[PDB]
Write a protein that binds this ligand. Sequence first.
Ligand code: BEF
Ligand code: BEF
Ligand SMILES: [Mg+2]
Ligand SMILES: [Mg+2]
Lengths: 119, 119
Amino acid sequence: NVRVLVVEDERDLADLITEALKKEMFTVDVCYDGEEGMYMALNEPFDVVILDIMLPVHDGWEILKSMRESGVNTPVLMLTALSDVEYRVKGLNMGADDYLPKPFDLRELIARVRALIRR
Amino acid sequence: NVRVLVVEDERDLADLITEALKKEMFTVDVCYDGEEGMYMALNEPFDVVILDIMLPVHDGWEILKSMRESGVNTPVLMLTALSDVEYRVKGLNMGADDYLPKPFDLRELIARVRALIRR
Ligand code: BEF
Ligand code: BEF
Ligand SMILES: [Mg+2]
Ligand SMILES: [Mg+2]
């Protein structure tokens, strides 16, 4: 009943995130690059999109804007090493629904993803 | 026009936030205690509620809990000095949509506020 898209280039972390989400009983599709990320985010239906910023081919910024520019209002959560507040504002102002810098606490990530779905 | 409710017992801070918000074009109502905040939150309509936790007569946990139990699905942002991640998770789990600890960057506060009312 809940499909989550994960876009993160650090495979092991991406898998860590995915397993945690699946343990919440969510259907999770994971991408290790911004190319497939973009494709999945623009062609497949999701309830939440967890997005890394710095990615190959297309960065999290581009993926978010393309989604909004295409009418896809799916809730977006950015998870990235760009932690400076200025970046947080940039992501949010651009259309992200939440922004959680790395390193992150797994409990907070799940809590925030759940906050986005029920909403 | 957008309605924002502010519940903070730190008058100076509360007023500071109230000013900044209206500057961003927001109809703000400020409360300095949990008594005025409890009423407004459970009886008056808002687009987003910014809830401090430690307050006289009624604490933020109480107000947030009373809201969700009464069917008030209004977006809620917790702005509190209870910064520990475990408090953040509890806040999100209880029904808050976002949780921002103190001290905070005023830019991140309105960025998050607008992102919340953006739905
Ligand atoms: F490379 Be991501 F922005 F952490
Ligand atoms: F008084 Be609040 F909880 F920062
Ligand atoms: Mg990356
Ligand atoms: Mg207080």
